[PDB]
Coordinates of C-alpha atoms and ligand atoms in Angstrom, one line a residue:
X1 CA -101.9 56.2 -91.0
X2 CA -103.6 58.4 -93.9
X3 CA -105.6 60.9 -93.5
X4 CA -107.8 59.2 -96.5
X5 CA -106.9 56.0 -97.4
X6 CA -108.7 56.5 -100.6
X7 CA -106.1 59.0 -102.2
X8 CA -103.5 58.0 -104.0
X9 CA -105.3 54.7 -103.9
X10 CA -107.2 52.5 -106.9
X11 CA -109.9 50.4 -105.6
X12 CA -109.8 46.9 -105.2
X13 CA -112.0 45.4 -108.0
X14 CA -113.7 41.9 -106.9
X15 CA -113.3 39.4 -109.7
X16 CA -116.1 37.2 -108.2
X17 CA -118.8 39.9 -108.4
X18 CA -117.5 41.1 -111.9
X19 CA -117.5 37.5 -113.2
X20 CA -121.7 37.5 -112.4
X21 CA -121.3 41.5 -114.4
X22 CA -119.7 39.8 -117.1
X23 CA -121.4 36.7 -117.6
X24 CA -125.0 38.6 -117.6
X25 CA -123.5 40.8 -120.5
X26 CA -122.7 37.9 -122.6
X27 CA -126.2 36.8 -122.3
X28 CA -127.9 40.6 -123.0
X29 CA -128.8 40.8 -126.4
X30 CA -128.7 45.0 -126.6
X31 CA -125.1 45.2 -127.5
X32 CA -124.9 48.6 -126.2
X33 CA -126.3 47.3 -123.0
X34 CA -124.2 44.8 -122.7
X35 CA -121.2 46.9 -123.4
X36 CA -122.5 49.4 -120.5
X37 CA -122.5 45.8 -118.3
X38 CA -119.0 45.2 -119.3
X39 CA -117.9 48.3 -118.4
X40 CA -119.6 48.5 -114.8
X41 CA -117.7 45.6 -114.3
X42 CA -114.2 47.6 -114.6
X43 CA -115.4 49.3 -111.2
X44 CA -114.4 48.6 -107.4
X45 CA -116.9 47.0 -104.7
X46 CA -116.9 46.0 -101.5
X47 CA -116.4 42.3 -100.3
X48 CA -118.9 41.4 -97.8
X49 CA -118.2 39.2 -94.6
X50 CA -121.7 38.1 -94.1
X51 CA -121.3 34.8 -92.2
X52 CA -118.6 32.4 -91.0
X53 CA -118.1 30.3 -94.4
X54 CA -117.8 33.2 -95.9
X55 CA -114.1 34.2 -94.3
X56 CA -113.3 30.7 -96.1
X57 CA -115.2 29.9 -98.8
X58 CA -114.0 30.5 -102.7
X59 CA -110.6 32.1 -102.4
X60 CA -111.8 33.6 -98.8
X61 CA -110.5 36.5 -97.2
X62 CA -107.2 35.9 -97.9
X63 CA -107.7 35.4 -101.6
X64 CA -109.0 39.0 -101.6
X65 CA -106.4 40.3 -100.1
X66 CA -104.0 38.3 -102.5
X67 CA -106.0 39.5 -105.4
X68 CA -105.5 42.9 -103.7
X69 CA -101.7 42.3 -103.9
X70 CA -101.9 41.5 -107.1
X71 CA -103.9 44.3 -108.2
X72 CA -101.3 46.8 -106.2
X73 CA -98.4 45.0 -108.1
X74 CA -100.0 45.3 -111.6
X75 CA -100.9 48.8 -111.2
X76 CA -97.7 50.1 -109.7
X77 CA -100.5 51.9 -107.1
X78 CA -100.9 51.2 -103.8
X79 CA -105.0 49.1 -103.9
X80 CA -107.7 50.2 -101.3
X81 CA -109.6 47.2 -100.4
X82 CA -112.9 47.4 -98.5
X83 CA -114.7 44.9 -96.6
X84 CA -118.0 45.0 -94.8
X85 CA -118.3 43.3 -91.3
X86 CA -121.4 41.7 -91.3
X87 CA -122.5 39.1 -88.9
X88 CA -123.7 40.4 -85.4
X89 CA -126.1 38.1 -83.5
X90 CA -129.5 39.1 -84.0
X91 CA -128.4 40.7 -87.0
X92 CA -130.7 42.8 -89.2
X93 CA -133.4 42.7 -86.2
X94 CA -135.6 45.2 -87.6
X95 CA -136.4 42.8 -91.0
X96 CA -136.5 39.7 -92.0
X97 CA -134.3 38.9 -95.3
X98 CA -131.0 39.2 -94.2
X99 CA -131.4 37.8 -90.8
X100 CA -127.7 36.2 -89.7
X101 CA -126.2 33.0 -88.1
X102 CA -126.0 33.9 -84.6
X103 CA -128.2 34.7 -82.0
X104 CA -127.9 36.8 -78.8
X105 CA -129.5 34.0 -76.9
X106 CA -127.7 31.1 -78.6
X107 CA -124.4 32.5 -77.4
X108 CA -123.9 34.7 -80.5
X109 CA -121.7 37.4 -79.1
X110 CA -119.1 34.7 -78.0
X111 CA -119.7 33.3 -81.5
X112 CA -118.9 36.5 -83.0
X113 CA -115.5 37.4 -80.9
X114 CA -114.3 34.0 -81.2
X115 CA -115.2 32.2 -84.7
X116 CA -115.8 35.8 -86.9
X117 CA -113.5 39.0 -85.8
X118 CA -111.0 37.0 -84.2
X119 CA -109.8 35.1 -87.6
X120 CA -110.8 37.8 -89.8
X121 CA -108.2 39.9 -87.5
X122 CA -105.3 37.0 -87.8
X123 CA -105.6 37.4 -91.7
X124 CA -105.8 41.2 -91.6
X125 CA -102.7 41.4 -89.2
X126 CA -100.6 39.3 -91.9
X127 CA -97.5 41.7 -92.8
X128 CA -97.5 40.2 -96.4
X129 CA -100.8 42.6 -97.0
X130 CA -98.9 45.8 -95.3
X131 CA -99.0 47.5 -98.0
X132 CA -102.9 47.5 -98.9
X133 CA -105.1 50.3 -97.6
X134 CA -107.7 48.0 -96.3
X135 CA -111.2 50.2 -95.3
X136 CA -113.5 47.9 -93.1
X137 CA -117.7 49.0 -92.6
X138 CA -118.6 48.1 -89.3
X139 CA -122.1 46.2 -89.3
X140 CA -124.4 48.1 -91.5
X141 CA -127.9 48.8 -89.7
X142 CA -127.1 47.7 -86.4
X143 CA -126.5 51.0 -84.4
X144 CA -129.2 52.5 -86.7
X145 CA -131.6 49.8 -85.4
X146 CA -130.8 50.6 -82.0
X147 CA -131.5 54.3 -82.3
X148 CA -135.4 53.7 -83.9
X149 CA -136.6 50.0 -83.4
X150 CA -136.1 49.4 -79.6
X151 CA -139.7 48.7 -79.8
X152 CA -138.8 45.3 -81.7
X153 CA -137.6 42.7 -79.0
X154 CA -135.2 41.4 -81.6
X155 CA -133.7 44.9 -81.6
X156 CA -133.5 45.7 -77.6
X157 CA -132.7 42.3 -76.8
X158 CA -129.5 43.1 -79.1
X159 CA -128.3 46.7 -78.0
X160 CA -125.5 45.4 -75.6
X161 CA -124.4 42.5 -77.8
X162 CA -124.2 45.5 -80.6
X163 CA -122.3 47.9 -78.6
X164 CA -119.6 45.1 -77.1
X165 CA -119.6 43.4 -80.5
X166 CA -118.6 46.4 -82.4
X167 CA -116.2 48.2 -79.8
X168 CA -114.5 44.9 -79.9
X169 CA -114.0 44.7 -83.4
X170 CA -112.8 48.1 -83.5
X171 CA -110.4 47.5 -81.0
X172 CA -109.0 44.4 -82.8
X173 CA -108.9 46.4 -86.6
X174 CA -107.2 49.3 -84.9
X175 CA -104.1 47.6 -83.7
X176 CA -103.4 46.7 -87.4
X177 CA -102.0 50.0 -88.9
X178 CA -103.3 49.7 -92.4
X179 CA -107.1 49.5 -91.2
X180 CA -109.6 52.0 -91.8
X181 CA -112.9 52.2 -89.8
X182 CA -115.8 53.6 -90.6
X183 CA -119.0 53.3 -88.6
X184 CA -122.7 52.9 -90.7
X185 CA -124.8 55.4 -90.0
X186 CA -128.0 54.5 -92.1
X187 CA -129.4 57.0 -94.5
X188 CA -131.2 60.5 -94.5
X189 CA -134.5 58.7 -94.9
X190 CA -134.0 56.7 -92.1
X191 CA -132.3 58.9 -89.2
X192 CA -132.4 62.5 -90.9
X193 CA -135.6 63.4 -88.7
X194 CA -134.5 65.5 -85.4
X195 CA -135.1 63.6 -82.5
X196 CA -133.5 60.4 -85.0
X197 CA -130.6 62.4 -85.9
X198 CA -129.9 63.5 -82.4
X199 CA -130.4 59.9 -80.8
X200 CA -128.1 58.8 -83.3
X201 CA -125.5 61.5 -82.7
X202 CA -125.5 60.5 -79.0
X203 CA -125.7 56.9 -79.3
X204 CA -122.5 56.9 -81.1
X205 CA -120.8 59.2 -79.1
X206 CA -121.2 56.5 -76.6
X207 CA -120.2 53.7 -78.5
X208 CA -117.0 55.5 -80.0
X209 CA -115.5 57.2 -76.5
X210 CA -116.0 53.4 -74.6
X211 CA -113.4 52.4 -77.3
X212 CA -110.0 51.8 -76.3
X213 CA -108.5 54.4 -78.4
X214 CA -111.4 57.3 -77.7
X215 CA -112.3 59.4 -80.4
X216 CA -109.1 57.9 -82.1
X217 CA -110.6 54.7 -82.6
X218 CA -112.4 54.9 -85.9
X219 CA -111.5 57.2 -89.2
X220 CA -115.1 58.3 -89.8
X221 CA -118.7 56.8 -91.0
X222 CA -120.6 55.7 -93.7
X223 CA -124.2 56.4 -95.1
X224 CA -126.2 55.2 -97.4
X225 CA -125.2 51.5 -97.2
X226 CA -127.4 49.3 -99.5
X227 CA -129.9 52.2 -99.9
X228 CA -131.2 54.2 -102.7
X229 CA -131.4 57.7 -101.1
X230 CA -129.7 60.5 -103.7
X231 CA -126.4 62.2 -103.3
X232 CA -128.3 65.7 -103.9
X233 CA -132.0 66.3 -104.6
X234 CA -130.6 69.8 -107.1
X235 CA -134.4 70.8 -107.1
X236 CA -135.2 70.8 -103.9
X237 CA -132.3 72.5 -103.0
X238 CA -134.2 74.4 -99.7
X239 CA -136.1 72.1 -97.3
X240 CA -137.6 75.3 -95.8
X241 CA -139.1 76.9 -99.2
X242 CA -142.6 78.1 -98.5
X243 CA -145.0 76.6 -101.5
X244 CA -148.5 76.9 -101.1
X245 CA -148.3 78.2 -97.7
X246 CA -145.9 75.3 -96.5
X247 CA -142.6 74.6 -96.0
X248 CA -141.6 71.8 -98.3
X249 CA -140.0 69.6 -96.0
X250 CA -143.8 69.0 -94.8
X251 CA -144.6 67.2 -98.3
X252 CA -146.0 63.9 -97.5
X253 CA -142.8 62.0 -99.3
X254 CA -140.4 63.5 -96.2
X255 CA -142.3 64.1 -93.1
X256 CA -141.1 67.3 -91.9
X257 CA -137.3 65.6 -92.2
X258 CA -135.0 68.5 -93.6
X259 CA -132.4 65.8 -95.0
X260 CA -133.4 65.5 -98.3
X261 CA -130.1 63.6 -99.8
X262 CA -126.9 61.9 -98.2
X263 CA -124.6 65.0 -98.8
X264 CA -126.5 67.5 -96.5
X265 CA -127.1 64.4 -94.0
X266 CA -123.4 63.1 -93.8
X267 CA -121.6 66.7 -93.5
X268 CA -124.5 67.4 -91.1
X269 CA -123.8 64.5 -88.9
X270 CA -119.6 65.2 -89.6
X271 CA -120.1 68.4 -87.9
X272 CA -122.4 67.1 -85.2
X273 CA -119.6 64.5 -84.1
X274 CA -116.6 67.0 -84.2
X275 CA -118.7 69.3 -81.8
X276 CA -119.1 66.7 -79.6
X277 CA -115.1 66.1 -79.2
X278 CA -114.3 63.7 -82.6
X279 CA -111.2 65.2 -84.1
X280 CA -111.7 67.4 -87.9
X281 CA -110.1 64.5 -89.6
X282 CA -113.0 62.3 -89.3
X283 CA -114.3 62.0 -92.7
X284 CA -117.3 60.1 -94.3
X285 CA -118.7 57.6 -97.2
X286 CA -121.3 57.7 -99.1
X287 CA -122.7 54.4 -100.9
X288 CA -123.6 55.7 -104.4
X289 CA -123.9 52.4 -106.0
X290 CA -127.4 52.2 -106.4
X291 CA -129.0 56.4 -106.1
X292 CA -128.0 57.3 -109.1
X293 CA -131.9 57.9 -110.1
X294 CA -131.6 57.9 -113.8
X295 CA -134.1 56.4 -116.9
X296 CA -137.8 55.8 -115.6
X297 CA -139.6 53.7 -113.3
X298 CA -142.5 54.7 -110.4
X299 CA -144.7 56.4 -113.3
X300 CA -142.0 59.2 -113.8
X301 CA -138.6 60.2 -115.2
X302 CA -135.9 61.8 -113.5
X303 CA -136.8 65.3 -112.9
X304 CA -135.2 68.3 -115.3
X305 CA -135.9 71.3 -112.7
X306 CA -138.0 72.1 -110.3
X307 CA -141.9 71.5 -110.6
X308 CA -143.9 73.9 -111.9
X309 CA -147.0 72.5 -110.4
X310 CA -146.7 75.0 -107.0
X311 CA -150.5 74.1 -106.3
X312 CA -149.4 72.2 -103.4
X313 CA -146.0 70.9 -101.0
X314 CA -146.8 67.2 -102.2
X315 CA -147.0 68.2 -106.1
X316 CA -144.5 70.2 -106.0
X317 CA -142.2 67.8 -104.2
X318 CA -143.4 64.7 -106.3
X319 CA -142.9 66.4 -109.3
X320 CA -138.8 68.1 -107.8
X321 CA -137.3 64.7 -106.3
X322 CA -134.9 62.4 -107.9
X323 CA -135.8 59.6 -105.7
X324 CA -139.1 58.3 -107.1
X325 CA -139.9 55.7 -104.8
X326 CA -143.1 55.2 -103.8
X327 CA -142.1 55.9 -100.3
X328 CA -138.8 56.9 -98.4
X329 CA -139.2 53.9 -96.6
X330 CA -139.0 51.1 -99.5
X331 CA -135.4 49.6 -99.2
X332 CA -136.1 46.7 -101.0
X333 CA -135.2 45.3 -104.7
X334 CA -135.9 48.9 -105.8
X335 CA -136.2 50.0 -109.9
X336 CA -133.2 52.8 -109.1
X337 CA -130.2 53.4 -111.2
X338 CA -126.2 52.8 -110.5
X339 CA -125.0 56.7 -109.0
X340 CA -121.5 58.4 -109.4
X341 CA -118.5 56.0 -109.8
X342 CA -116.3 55.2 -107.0
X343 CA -114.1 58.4 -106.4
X344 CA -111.8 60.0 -103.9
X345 CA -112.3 62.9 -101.6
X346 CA -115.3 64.1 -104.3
X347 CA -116.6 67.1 -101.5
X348 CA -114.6 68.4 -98.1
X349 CA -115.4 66.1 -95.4
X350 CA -116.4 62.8 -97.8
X351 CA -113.5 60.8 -98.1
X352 CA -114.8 59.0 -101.7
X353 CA -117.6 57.5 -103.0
X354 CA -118.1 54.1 -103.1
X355 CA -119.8 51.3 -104.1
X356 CA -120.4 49.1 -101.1
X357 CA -124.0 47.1 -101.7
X358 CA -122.4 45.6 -104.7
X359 CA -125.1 46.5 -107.6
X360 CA -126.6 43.2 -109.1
X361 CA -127.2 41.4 -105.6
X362 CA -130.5 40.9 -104.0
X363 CA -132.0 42.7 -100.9
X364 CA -134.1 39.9 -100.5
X365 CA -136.4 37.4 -101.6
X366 CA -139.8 38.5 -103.5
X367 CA -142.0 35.5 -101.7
X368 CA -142.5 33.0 -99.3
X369 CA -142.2 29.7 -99.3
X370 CA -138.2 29.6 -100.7
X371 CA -135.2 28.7 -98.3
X372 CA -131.8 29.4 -99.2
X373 CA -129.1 26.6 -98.1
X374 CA -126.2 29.1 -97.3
X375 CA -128.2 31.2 -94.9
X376 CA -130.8 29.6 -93.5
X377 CA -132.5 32.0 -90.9
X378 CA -132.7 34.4 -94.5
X379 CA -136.4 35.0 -95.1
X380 CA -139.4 36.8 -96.8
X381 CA -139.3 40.2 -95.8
X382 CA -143.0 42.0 -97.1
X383 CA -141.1 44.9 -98.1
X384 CA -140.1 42.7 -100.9
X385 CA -143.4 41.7 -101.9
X386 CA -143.8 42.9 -105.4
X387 CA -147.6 42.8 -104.9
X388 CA -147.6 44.0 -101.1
X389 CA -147.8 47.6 -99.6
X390 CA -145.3 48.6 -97.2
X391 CA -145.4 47.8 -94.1
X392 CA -144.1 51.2 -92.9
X393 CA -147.1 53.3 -94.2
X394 CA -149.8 50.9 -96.2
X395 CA -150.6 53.3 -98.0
X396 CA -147.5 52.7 -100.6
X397 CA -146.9 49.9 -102.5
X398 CA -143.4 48.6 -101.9
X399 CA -142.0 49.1 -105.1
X400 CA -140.1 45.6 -104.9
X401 CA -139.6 44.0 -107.9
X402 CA -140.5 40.6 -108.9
X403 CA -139.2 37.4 -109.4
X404 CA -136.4 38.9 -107.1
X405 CA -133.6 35.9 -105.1
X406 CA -132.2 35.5 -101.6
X407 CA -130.5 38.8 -100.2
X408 CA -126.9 38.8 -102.3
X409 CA -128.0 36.4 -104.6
X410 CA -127.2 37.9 -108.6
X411 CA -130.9 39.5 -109.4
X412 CA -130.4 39.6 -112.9
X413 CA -133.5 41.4 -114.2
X414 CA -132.5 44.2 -111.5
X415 CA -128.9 44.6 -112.6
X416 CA -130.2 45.3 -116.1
X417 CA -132.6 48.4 -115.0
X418 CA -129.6 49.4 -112.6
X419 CA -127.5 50.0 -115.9
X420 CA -129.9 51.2 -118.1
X421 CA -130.9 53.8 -115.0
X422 CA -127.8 54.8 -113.9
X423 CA -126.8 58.5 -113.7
X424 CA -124.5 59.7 -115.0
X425 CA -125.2 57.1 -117.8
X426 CA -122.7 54.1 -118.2
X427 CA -120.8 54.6 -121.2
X428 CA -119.3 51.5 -123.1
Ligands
LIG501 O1 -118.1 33.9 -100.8 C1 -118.5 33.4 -102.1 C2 -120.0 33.3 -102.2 O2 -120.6 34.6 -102.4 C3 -122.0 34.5 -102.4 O3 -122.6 35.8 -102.5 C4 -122.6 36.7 -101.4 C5 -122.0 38.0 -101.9 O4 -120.6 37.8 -102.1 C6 -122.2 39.1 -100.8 O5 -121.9 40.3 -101.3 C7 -123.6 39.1 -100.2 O6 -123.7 40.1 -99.2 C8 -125.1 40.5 -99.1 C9 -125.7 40.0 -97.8 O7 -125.8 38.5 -97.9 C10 -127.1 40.6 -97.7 O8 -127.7 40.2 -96.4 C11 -127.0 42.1 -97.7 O9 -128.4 42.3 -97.8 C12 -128.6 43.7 -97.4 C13 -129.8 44.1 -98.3 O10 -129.3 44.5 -99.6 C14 -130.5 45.2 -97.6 O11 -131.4 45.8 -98.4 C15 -131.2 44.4 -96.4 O12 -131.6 43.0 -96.9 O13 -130.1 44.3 -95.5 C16 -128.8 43.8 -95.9 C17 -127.8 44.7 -95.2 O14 -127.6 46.0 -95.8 O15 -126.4 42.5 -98.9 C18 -125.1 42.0 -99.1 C19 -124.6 42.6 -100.4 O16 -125.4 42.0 -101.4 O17 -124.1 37.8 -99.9 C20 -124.0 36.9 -100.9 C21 -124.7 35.6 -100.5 O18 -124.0 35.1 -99.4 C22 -122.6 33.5 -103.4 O19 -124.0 33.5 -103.3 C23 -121.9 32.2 -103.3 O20 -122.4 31.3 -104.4 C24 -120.4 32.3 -103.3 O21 -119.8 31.0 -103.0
LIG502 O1 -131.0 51.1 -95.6 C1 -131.1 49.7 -95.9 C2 -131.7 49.0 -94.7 O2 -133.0 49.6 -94.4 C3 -133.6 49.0 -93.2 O3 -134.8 49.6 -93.1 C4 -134.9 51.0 -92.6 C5 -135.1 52.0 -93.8 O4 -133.9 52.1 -94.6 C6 -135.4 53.4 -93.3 O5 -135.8 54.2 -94.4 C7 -136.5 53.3 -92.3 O6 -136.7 54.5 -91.8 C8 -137.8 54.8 -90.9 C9 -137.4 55.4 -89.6 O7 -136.6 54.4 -88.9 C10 -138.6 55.8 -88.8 O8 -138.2 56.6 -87.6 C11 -139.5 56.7 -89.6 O9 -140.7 57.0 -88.8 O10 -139.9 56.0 -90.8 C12 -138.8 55.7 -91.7 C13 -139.4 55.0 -92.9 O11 -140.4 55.8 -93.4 O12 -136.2 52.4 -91.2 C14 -136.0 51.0 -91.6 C15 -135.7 50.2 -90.4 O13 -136.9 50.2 -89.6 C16 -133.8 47.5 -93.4 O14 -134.4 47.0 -92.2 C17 -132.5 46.9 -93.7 O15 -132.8 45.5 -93.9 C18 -131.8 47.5 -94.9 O16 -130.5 47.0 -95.1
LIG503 CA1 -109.2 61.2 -92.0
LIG504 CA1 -129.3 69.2 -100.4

């Protein structure tokens, strides 16, 4: 195996989500705009497996991969495909728009083994797609879920479903020599906090070493996954820096967290796992498809420097951070921008960027009373209520915006402020 599967590699671009890219541009009347559309649908995203249909359904896994193939011969370069496994019982038990299929108390973990890994592991194992890197994301915001929301019966009920579920999907991908595993590992603004980051740190020390293969068993993690949270906050460079008497990791915006962005938080984390016994060749993701933070929205503009209102740790702060949501907290249907470009080994210890929440799909739909046909236990989450305040701190206003489709479903008044946002710009 590599030692990055993303060198040497050009990403696999998905010609189902590029066809929505292309078809909204032909419909923008901006012509630069829709040139900037046309052009972020040259770039590489993941393919999610977010149900049982979907291993099937339109050309299915296997048309990916044949796509892939074809892709790789076109090229002349070996193609790095990414897929995100995505359908654990009780899945997302902490929310409510992208609950899953299968329940831990309808037999869901048999239903998982049995009619989700096993046949997505009889495709991947097919020789004819040897010669693909294929990178697999394990279950985004499962093992995060387990380190903050045991208080949510959904959540506990799950934890031993999610730790056999995933240790046996690991242990299926890594007898095919060509897989890549990374683990999800949430976000700064979800597990940067000390007692978060250390509960994390442990719980998947645990999950990992029960693998078959030990610390072997996976290549790294991921962060970031379907979230908004910067690469780098450049202004608030210091979470310790004293203004107005405080340190400005108090500011009301981070809680006394000192992860601030995804680069400080993943290398953190890198370290953290090699001193507890993971070998130095771990390396990790970040998802920079939708924390790119440029144009405006929130009541502000990306920031040029750092505040010079030093009157206060929340002025200050407010007026230094590239992520201007209203809270850390709001991970739905956000006004952010598309971030850095898919990209190989861009800082020691990330293996590449990438753009895994394919920008353009929904996180959810923006009020009740709507049922989707293709996942039926998808609902109305409030943190996509336009109108609502979050449920997190009331205080805040969600930030959602409106008129916003089921989770994956194209959002197409979103895509256009991720384009027009994006940073560095799009250029045609
Ligand atoms: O297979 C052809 C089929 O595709 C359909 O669209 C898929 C789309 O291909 C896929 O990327 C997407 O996956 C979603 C997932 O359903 C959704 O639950 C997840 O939502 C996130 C969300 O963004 C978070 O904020 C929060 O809600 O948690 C989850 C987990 O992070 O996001 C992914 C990526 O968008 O699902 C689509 C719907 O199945 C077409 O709709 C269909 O017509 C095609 O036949
Ligand atoms: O990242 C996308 C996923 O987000 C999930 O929500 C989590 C938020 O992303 C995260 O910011 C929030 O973090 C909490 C933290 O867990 C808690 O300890 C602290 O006190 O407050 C933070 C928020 O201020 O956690 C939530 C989960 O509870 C969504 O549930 C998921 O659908 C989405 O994909
Ligand atoms: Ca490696
Ligand atoms: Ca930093």
């Amino acid at each position: 195996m590599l030692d990055n599967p993303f060198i040497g590699a050009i990403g696999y671009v998905n010609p189902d989500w590029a066809t929505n890219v292309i078809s909204q541009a032909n419909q923008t009347a901006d012509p630069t705009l829709a040139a900037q559309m046309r052009k972020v649908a040259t770039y590489s995203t993941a393919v999610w497996l977010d149900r049982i249909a979907a291993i099937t359904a339109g050309r299915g896994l296997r048309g990916h991969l044949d796509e892939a193939l074809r892709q790789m011969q076109q090229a002349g370069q070996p193609v790095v495909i990414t897929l995100v496994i995505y359908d654990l019982p009780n899945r997302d038990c902490s929310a409510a728009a992208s609950n899953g299929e299968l329940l831990v108390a309808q037999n869901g973990l048999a239903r998982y083994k049995a009619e989700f890994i096993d046949p997505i592991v009889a495709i991947l194992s097919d020789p004819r797609y040897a010669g693909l890197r294929i990178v697999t994301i394990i279950e985004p915001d499962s093992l995060p879920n387990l380190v903050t929301n045991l208080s949510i019966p959904a959540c506990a009920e799950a934890q031993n479903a999610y730790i056999e579920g995933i240790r046996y999907a690991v242990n299926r991908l890594r007898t095919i020599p060509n897989v890549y595993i990374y683990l999800d590992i949430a976000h700064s603004g979800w597990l940067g906090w000390d007692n978060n980051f250390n509960g994390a740190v442990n719980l998947y020390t645990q999950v990992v070493q029960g693998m078959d293969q030990g610390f072997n068993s996976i290549d790294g993690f991921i962060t970031n996954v379907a979230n908004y949270t910067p690469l780098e906050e450049p202004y608030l460079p210091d979470p310790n820096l004293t203004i107005a008497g405080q340190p400005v990791r108090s500011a009301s915006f981070y809680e006394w967290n000192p992860y601030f962005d995804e680069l400080d938080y993943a290398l953190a984390l890198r370290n953290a796992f090699i001193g507890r016994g993971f070998p130095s060749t771990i390396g990790m993701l970040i998802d920079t498809s939708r924390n790119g933070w440029g144009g405006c929205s929130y009541g502000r503009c990306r920031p040029t420097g750092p505040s010079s209102d030093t009157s206060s740790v929340n002025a200050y702060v407010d007026g230094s951070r590239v992520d201007r949501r209203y809270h850390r907290g709001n991970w739905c249907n956000q006004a952010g921008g598309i971030g850095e470009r898919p990209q190989a080994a861009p800082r020691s210890g990330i293996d590449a960027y990438v753009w895994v929440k394919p920008p353009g799909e929904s996180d959810g739909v923006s009020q009740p009373g709507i049922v989707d046909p293709d996942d039926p236990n998808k609902k109305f989450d409030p943190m996509c209520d336009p109108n609502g305040q979050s449920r997190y701190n009331s205080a805040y206003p969600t930030g959602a915006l409106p008129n916003a489709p089921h989770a994956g479903r194209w959002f197409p008044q979103q895509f256009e402020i991720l384009v027009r946002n994006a940073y560095p710009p799009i250029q045609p």
